[PDB]
Amino acid sequence: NLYFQAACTRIINLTSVLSLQEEINEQGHEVLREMLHNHSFVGCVNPQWALAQHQTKLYLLNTTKLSEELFYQILIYDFANFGVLRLSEPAPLFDLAMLALDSPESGWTEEDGPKEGLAEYIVEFLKKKAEMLADYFSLEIDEEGNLIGLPLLIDNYVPPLEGLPIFILRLATEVNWDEEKECFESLSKECAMFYSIRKQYISWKWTVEHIVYKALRSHILPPKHFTEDGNILQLANLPDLYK
């Protein structure tokens, strides 16, 4: 705590991460966990929605939010213990920030100030956070301000890289870099979203079924709100399925 004064690849004493670990465990819905552990996968409707069967029930599942939640929990639980996913091509944080700023999801306006200057600031700001980012999150930025590494949260998974610019932006602009708990939480949340399957940034059917949904058998304590928020829907019951 000085800094503040699952992929099949050290202990964390920090009371902030162990507290976030406890918060996940608390909302953990065991019957949903069982359903996901034992699902038989049916197919993807689109990148956002998948169909799965458990006993005689057919479920519609929000892959986007399920994978988001999955990666968030893996971030909190494998914290500081991540394998590294090397980028084949190093990506200048500057170009990434510019790609972010030149896109409508940035919400950039002239009141923000010129783009180049904001891009440069983002690079310098992220260079400062680099040691901590590489240490705890295996998010690797070198002294040239190139991104060279991302956490390998699960094996054989590369997050949709078209989401990389906006990830980089929100990492500087949306993360609470000032309070330890809100930092680790908001960072993991931003990273979770970047890793999540999101249709706008989308062979992917294969990854969803065999990589993402496989890890959903093991590495998620799904929250209780999933039974009511519309991320998991029972579409039908087939009583004679096993008859």
Which lies closer to a copy of itself via its Cβ, residue 16 or residue 48?
Answer: 48
Q: How far is CA 166 from CA 62, 148, 190, in A?
A: 22, 17, 10
Dihedral, 125, 126, 129, 135 alpha carbons, nearest 10: 180
Which lies closer to a copy of itself via its Cβ, residue 27 or residue 38?
Answer: 38
Q: Is 233 in the site for a copy of itself (CB under 8 A)?
A: yes
Q: Is 148 in the site for a copy of itself (CB under 8 A)?
A: no
Q: 14 to 73, contacts with a copy of itself by CB under 8 A?
A: 41-47, 49, 51, 53, 58, 60
Residue 215: count other Cβ atoms within 10 Å of its Cβ.
Answer: 21
Q: Is 204 in the site for a copy of itself (CB under 8 A)?
A: no
Q: Is 94 in the site for a copy of itself (CB under 8 A)?
A: no
Half-sphere exposure of 185 (CA within 13 A, CB side): 15
Q: Is 211 in the site for a copy of itself (CB under 8 A)?
A: no
Which lies closer to a copy of itself via its Cβ, residue 46 or residue 218?
Answer: 46
Q: Say if CB 210 and CB 157 are below 8 A apart.
A: no
Q: For the stretch 221-236, what's the b/e string if a residue is b when 16 or more beta carbons lie within 10 angstroms of its beta carbon?
A: bbbeebeeeebbeeee
Which lies closer to a copy of itself via its Cβ, residue 43 or residue 107?
Answer: 43
Q: Is 161 in the site for a copy of itself (CB under 8 A)?
A: no
**Choice from 199, 210, 217, 225 touching a copy of itself (CB under 8 A):** 199
Phi, psi torsion values for 59, nearest 5 degrees: -110, 140
Cα gap 210→105, rounded to integer Å: 30
Residue numbers at the binding site for a copy of itself (CB under 8 A)? 41-47, 49, 51, 53, 58, 60, 199-200, 202, 233, 235-236, 238, 241, 243
